[PDB]
């Protein structure tokens, strides 16, 4: 299509106006189907494997619920622990052209939280999440901690916050995005807006990409927000594996 | 493909969920330029000849703001007047991915208006509108009249929800683009916003018999039949109506 909603979408981004833009992706995710509880789906997200090795504690990320996300966003990030720890990445449902979407801000946590407990292999774990990721890592980690008393041995948060950055990450796997896609995304984000916070116990690191203008470490990373998982994803891994053998 | 907006809207209407495509489908027409005056177009909607004839006057057709709507819609009707007069439909704008849309109701009914007179190439005519093309086609009568001073010869209203579902469930198929979806969401959305103008040139409404359970006329036909198998006696109807003129 030549008037895609791709298209739209990413002329809505470069014209800022993105008020519009997320009025009408909204409207469109409220139109899909939904699920309220993970025994309604077929089955779980599948955990892609990024990197193995004989390290541990092993790390599950979770990809960033944007319409171009997907496990390919910790590739580059994974490349540096090739052969030193196991990685693998989540998928969040709803993105591909079946699938349902979370009807609840706790129904998207647990899928993510039950997803990582699948991807754990009952092993020790870390759960990361890049920008937008972080909060639902966070919180899946809580929600782990909580309702199954199984705890992580931390959590990883690269550059989460608590616009232009919206822009930003579309106008730098070049996936397509479906109009799943791109719906998946605004009930994904709607959700992130709507969640409860809440404490884990558990060690987190919040890496800040120095750039950029329930016992927490902060480290910083000579990266922007973008290039801390591409081009400087190096320097970011290697900040995560020092802190995790600190432990 | 698979999750197009067309499948979307068609599963929503078997759904119930009406209000709600057209939410999204407005969400996103807002999402497109606009304009407020004519001559803000590169050009105006082209007229599309469906007959050619000596008789008089001329009929001009405005499609029906639907997604699967446009200038094939009167093909049929038109077809019963191939050697008998000119007969032509207009596009409305904003359909084609080009296009930009109305801003407002009296955007609307000036485009509207702008592009009968373009069709009509300076001859006597008669403005025609199926359905919801109805309240378009009248109200561009009466704004060629009461502004621009230019009478009709007459309007013909041609039968101006289910009705929905079944207008969407052909014939002559047509791919409902984001475009054809955007553009209906915003053409219909004004309907509801149209004040009613008078004009004093004849207005002929010819009702579809089969949904009942200024002269008016009826047929033996439902609203989508009296353009489809019963064209050829709406078009009867209208002709010797005109001609009783």
């Given amino acids: 299509e030549t008037d895609s909603l791709e298209r739209m979408f990413l002329d809505a981004l470069e014209s800022g106006r993105i008020p519009e833009a997320q009025r009408m992706l909204s409207a469109l995710g409220a139109l899909r189907p939904s699920f309220e509880n993970t025994a309604e789906l077929e089955d779980l997200p599948l955990p892609a494997t990024l990197a193995e090795g004989p390290g541990a504690p092993r790390l599950i990320c979770v990809s960033t619920p944007t319409a171009n996300g997907g496990v390919h966003e910790y590739a580059r990030l994974a490349a540096s622990f090739r052969g030193e720890r196991h990685v ?7 993105f591909a052209a079946g699938e349902r979407l979370p009807a609840t801000p706790e129904t998207a946590v647990r899928v993510v939280a039950e ?30 901690e909580n309702t199954w008393g199984i705890r992580p041995e931390a959590v990883v948060l690269l550059d989460t916050l608590s616009a232009g950055l919206m822009r930003r990450h579309f106008m730098v796997s070049p996936v397509r995005m ?6 998946a995304m605004a009930r994904w984000m709607g959700m992130l807006n709507q969640l409860e916070v809440r404490h884990t116990t558990v060690p987190v690191l919040i890496i800040r990409a120095a750039k950029e203008t329930s016992p927490v470490d902060v480290r910083s990373v000579d990266a922007d927000h973008f290039s801390m998982v591409r081009d400087d994803a190096p320097e970011t891994a290697r900040i995560v594996k020092e802190w995790l053998d600190s432990l």
């Fill in 88 to 94: 693998s990445a989540l998928p969040l449902v709803g």
């Fill in 178 to 183: 479906t109009n799943s896609r791109l719906s």
């Fill in 115 to 144: 997803s990582t407990l699948r991807a754990s292999d009952g092993n020790p774990f870390v759960l990361v999440g890049h920008s937008s990721a972080g909060a639902f890592a966070y919180l899946a980690a809580a929600l782990l």
